[PDB]
Short mmCIF file of all heavy atoms in Angstrom, two decimals:
data_model
loop_
_atom_site.label_atom_id
_atom_site.label_comp_id
_atom_site.label_asym_id
_atom_site.label_seq_id
_atom_site.Cartn_x
_atom_site.Cartn_y
_atom_site.Cartn_z
N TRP A 1 157.53 131.01 83.43
CA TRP A 1 156.11 130.68 83.37
C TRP A 1 155.92 129.21 83.70
O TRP A 1 156.71 128.35 83.26
CB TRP A 1 155.52 130.97 81.99
CG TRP A 1 155.44 132.41 81.61
CD1 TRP A 1 154.39 133.25 81.82
CD2 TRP A 1 156.46 133.19 80.97
NE1 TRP A 1 154.68 134.51 81.34
CE2 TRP A 1 155.95 134.50 80.81
CE3 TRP A 1 157.74 132.91 80.52
CZ2 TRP A 1 156.68 135.51 80.23
CZ3 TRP A 1 158.46 133.92 79.92
CH2 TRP A 1 157.94 135.22 79.78
N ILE A 2 154.89 128.90 84.47
CA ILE A 2 154.52 127.53 84.80
C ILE A 2 153.16 127.26 84.16
O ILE A 2 152.12 127.63 84.72
CB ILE A 2 154.46 127.32 86.33
CG1 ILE A 2 155.76 127.77 86.97
CG2 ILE A 2 154.17 125.86 86.64
CD1 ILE A 2 155.84 127.43 88.44
N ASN A 3 153.17 126.65 82.99
CA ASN A 3 151.91 126.38 82.27
C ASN A 3 151.36 125.02 82.63
O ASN A 3 150.94 124.25 81.75
CB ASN A 3 152.14 126.53 80.78
CG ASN A 3 153.16 125.55 80.24
OD1 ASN A 3 154.35 125.70 80.49
ND2 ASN A 3 152.69 124.57 79.50
N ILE A 4 151.28 124.71 83.92
CA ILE A 4 150.60 123.55 84.45
C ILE A 4 150.16 123.87 85.86
O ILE A 4 150.87 124.55 86.60
CB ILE A 4 151.43 122.24 84.42
CG1 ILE A 4 152.85 122.51 84.92
CG2 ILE A 4 151.42 121.58 83.06
CD1 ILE A 4 153.58 121.27 85.40
N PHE A 5 148.98 123.38 86.26
CA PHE A 5 148.46 123.60 87.59
C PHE A 5 148.00 122.27 88.16
O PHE A 5 147.26 121.53 87.51
CB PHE A 5 147.31 124.60 87.58
CG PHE A 5 146.98 125.16 88.93
CD1 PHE A 5 147.59 126.31 89.37
CD2 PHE A 5 146.07 124.50 89.75
CE1 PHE A 5 147.29 126.82 90.62
CE2 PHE A 5 145.79 125.01 90.99
CZ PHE A 5 146.39 126.18 91.43
N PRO A 6 148.41 121.93 89.39
CA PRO A 6 147.99 120.66 90.03
C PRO A 6 146.63 120.76 90.67
O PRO A 6 146.48 121.01 91.88
CB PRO A 6 149.10 120.43 91.06
CG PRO A 6 150.03 121.64 90.97
CD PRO A 6 149.29 122.72 90.26
N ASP A 7 145.58 120.60 89.88
CA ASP A 7 144.22 120.70 90.35
C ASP A 7 143.48 119.38 90.39
O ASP A 7 142.25 119.36 90.57
CB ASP A 7 143.44 121.72 89.51
CG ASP A 7 143.58 121.46 88.02
OD1 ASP A 7 144.32 120.51 87.65
OD2 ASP A 7 142.94 122.19 87.22
N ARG A 8 144.18 118.27 90.22
CA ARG A 8 143.56 116.95 90.34
C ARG A 8 143.95 116.33 91.66
O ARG A 8 145.15 116.12 91.90
CB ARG A 8 144.01 116.04 89.19
CG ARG A 8 144.07 116.74 87.83
CD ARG A 8 142.70 117.17 87.35
NE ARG A 8 141.72 116.10 87.47
CZ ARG A 8 141.56 115.13 86.57
NH1 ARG A 8 142.31 115.04 85.49
NH2 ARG A 8 140.62 114.20 86.80
N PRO A 9 143.00 116.03 92.55
CA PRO A 9 143.36 115.48 93.85
C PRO A 9 143.57 113.98 93.83
O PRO A 9 142.96 113.23 93.06
CB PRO A 9 142.15 115.84 94.71
CG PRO A 9 141.02 115.86 93.76
CD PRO A 9 141.56 116.26 92.42
N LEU A 10 144.45 113.52 94.73
CA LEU A 10 144.70 112.11 94.98
C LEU A 10 144.50 111.82 96.45
O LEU A 10 144.95 112.58 97.30
CB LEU A 10 146.11 111.70 94.54
CG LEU A 10 146.41 111.73 93.05
CD1 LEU A 10 147.74 111.05 92.77
CD2 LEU A 10 145.29 111.07 92.27
N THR A 11 143.81 110.72 96.76
CA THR A 11 143.48 110.38 98.13
C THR A 11 144.37 109.23 98.64
O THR A 11 145.04 108.53 97.87
CB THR A 11 142.02 109.95 98.23
OG1 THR A 11 141.82 108.72 97.55
CG2 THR A 11 141.12 111.02 97.61
N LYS A 12 144.38 109.07 99.96
CA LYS A 12 145.14 108.02 100.60
C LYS A 12 144.44 107.62 101.88
O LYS A 12 144.05 108.48 102.67
CB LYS A 12 146.59 108.45 100.88
CG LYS A 12 147.42 107.42 101.62
CD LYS A 12 148.64 108.07 102.24
CE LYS A 12 149.36 107.12 103.18
NZ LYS A 12 148.42 106.47 104.15
N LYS A 13 144.27 106.31 102.09
CA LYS A 13 143.66 105.80 103.30
C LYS A 13 144.64 105.88 104.47
O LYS A 13 145.85 105.99 104.27
CB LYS A 13 143.21 104.37 103.09
CG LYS A 13 142.06 104.22 102.13
CD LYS A 13 140.72 104.41 102.83
CE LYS A 13 140.37 103.23 103.71
NZ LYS A 13 140.69 101.94 103.06
N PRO A 14 144.14 105.83 105.69
CA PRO A 14 145.03 105.78 106.87
C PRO A 14 145.94 104.55 106.81
O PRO A 14 145.60 103.52 106.24
CB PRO A 14 144.07 105.72 108.05
CG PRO A 14 142.69 105.59 107.49
CD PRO A 14 142.75 106.10 106.11
N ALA A 15 147.12 104.70 107.42
CA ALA A 15 148.20 103.73 107.21
C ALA A 15 147.80 102.34 107.68
O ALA A 15 148.08 101.35 107.01
CB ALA A 15 149.46 104.19 107.94
N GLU A 16 147.16 102.24 108.85
CA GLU A 16 146.84 100.95 109.44
C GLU A 16 145.33 100.74 109.34
O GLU A 16 144.58 101.13 110.25
CB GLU A 16 147.33 100.87 110.88
CG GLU A 16 148.81 101.24 111.07
CD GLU A 16 149.78 100.22 110.52
OE1 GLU A 16 149.33 99.19 109.96
OE2 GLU A 16 151.00 100.44 110.67
N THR A 17 144.89 100.13 108.25
CA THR A 17 143.47 99.86 108.02
C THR A 17 143.34 98.67 107.07
O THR A 17 144.15 98.50 106.17
CB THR A 17 142.76 101.09 107.43
OG1 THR A 17 143.16 102.28 108.11
CG2 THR A 17 141.23 100.94 107.58
N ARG A 18 142.29 97.86 107.29
CA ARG A 18 142.02 96.76 106.38
C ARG A 18 141.41 97.29 105.09
O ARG A 18 141.15 98.48 104.91
CB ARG A 18 141.08 95.75 107.04
CG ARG A 18 141.55 95.19 108.36
CD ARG A 18 141.72 93.66 108.28
NE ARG A 18 142.03 93.07 109.57
CZ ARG A 18 141.13 92.59 110.41
NH1 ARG A 18 139.84 92.59 110.12
NH2 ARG A 18 141.53 92.09 111.58
N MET A 19 141.19 96.37 104.16
CA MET A 19 140.76 96.73 102.82
C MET A 19 139.29 97.16 102.79
O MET A 19 138.43 96.49 103.37
CB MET A 19 140.97 95.53 101.88
CG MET A 19 141.42 95.91 100.51
SD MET A 19 142.80 97.05 100.57
CE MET A 19 142.41 98.03 99.14
N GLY A 20 139.04 98.28 102.12
CA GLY A 20 137.68 98.61 101.70
C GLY A 20 136.69 99.01 102.76
O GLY A 20 135.76 98.26 103.04
N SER A 21 136.87 100.18 103.37
CA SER A 21 135.87 100.71 104.31
C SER A 21 135.56 102.17 103.98
O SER A 21 135.48 103.03 104.87
CB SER A 21 136.34 100.56 105.75
OG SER A 21 135.53 101.33 106.63
N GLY A 22 135.39 102.46 102.71
CA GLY A 22 135.16 103.81 102.24
C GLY A 22 136.39 104.44 101.64
O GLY A 22 137.52 104.15 102.03
N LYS A 23 136.18 105.31 100.65
CA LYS A 23 137.29 105.94 99.97
C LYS A 23 138.04 106.88 100.91
O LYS A 23 137.44 107.54 101.76
CB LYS A 23 136.81 106.71 98.74
CG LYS A 23 137.94 107.20 97.83
CD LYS A 23 137.49 107.22 96.39
CE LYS A 23 138.52 107.95 95.52
NZ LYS A 23 139.80 107.23 95.44
N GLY A 24 139.36 106.95 100.75
CA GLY A 24 140.18 107.78 101.58
C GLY A 24 140.06 109.26 101.27
O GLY A 24 139.49 109.66 100.24
N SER A 25 140.60 110.10 102.20
CA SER A 25 140.60 111.55 102.13
C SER A 25 141.70 112.05 101.23
O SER A 25 142.74 111.41 101.09
CB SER A 25 140.76 112.15 103.53
OG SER A 25 141.84 111.55 104.21
N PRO A 26 141.51 113.21 100.57
CA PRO A 26 142.54 113.72 99.67
C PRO A 26 143.83 114.02 100.40
O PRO A 26 143.84 114.50 101.54
CB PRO A 26 141.91 115.02 99.11
CG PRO A 26 140.74 115.31 99.97
CD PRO A 26 140.29 114.01 100.57
N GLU A 27 144.94 113.73 99.74
CA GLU A 27 146.27 113.94 100.33
C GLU A 27 147.19 114.76 99.45
O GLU A 27 147.95 115.60 99.97
CB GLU A 27 146.92 112.59 100.64
CG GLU A 27 148.38 112.65 101.03
CD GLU A 27 148.58 112.54 102.52
OE1 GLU A 27 147.59 112.49 103.27
OE2 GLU A 27 149.76 112.46 102.95
N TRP A 28 147.15 114.57 98.13
CA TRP A 28 148.07 115.22 97.22
C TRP A 28 147.30 116.00 96.16
O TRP A 28 146.15 115.70 95.86
CB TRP A 28 149.00 114.23 96.54
CG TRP A 28 149.86 113.45 97.47
CD1 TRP A 28 151.00 113.88 98.07
CD2 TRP A 28 149.66 112.09 97.88
NE1 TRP A 28 151.52 112.88 98.85
CE2 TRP A 28 150.72 111.76 98.76
CE3 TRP A 28 148.71 111.12 97.62
CZ2 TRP A 28 150.84 110.52 99.36
CZ3 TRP A 28 148.81 109.87 98.21
CH2 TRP A 28 149.89 109.59 99.07
N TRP A 29 147.96 117.01 95.60
CA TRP A 29 147.46 117.73 94.42
C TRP A 29 148.42 117.49 93.27
O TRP A 29 149.62 117.71 93.40
CB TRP A 29 147.32 119.21 94.71
CG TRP A 29 146.23 119.53 95.67
CD1 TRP A 29 146.35 119.88 96.98
CD2 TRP A 29 144.83 119.53 95.40
NE1 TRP A 29 145.12 120.10 97.54
CE2 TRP A 29 144.15 119.87 96.58
CE3 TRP A 29 144.06 119.25 94.25
CZ2 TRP A 29 142.77 119.98 96.66
CZ3 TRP A 29 142.69 119.33 94.33
CH2 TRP A 29 142.06 119.70 95.53
N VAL A 30 147.88 117.04 92.13
CA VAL A 30 148.67 116.48 91.05
C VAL A 30 148.18 117.03 89.72
O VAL A 30 147.00 117.29 89.53
CB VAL A 30 148.65 114.94 91.10
CG1 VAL A 30 148.16 114.35 89.77
CG2 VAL A 30 150.02 114.39 91.45
N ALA A 31 149.12 117.19 88.79
CA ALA A 31 148.82 117.60 87.43
C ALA A 31 149.14 116.47 86.47
O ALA A 31 150.21 115.87 86.55
CB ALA A 31 149.62 118.87 87.05
N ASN A 32 148.21 116.20 85.56
CA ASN A 32 148.36 115.09 84.62
C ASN A 32 149.17 115.55 83.43
O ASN A 32 148.75 116.44 82.68
CB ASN A 32 146.98 114.61 84.17
CG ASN A 32 147.05 113.45 83.22
OD1 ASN A 32 148.02 112.69 83.22
ND2 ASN A 32 146.03 113.30 82.38
N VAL A 33 150.35 114.95 83.25
CA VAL A 33 151.32 115.36 82.24
C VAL A 33 151.48 114.23 81.22
O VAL A 33 151.67 113.08 81.61
CB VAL A 33 152.67 115.72 82.87
CG1 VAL A 33 153.76 115.76 81.81
CG2 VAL A 33 152.58 117.04 83.61
N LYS A 34 151.38 114.57 79.95
CA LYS A 34 151.55 113.64 78.85
C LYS A 34 152.74 114.04 78.01
O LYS A 34 153.17 115.19 78.04
CB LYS A 34 150.28 113.59 77.98
CG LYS A 34 149.03 113.13 78.69
CD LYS A 34 147.92 112.84 77.70
CE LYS A 34 146.66 112.43 78.41
NZ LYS A 34 145.66 111.92 77.43
N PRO A 35 153.32 113.11 77.26
CA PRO A 35 154.47 113.45 76.42
C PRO A 35 154.10 114.53 75.39
O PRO A 35 152.98 114.55 74.88
CB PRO A 35 154.81 112.14 75.72
CG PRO A 35 154.31 111.09 76.64
CD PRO A 35 153.08 111.64 77.26
N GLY A 36 155.04 115.43 75.15
CA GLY A 36 154.81 116.57 74.30
C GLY A 36 154.34 117.81 75.03
O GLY A 36 154.44 118.92 74.47
N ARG A 37 153.85 117.68 76.25
CA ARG A 37 153.40 118.82 77.02
C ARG A 37 154.60 119.64 77.48
O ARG A 37 155.57 119.08 78.00
CB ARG A 37 152.58 118.35 78.22
CG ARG A 37 152.04 119.48 79.08
CD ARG A 37 151.22 120.45 78.26
NE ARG A 37 150.40 121.31 79.10
CZ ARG A 37 149.08 121.23 79.18
NH1 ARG A 37 148.41 120.33 78.48
NH2 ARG A 37 148.44 122.05 80.00
#
């Protein structure tokens, strides 16, 4: 059984870009894990 699901997205800007021209597009799906889980 896998009692965790990666439903929180993480974004990343294009590799060659200066700072701050809009938030980047989603790239990864991640699950928030805390101790004891």
Side-chain angles (χ1 to χ4, degrees):
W1 291 268
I2 307 187
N3 61 288
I4 45 159
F5 196 91
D7 50 357
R8 320 294 312 278
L10 292 191
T11 68
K12 176 197 171 311
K13 292 274 288 317
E16 309 289 2
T17 317
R18 304 240 186 93
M19 217 48 216
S21 167
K23 190 149 169 67
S25 50
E27 169 103 354
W28 300 282
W29 290 105
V30 124
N32 181 27
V33 164
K34 298 192 182 190
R37 181 56 164 250

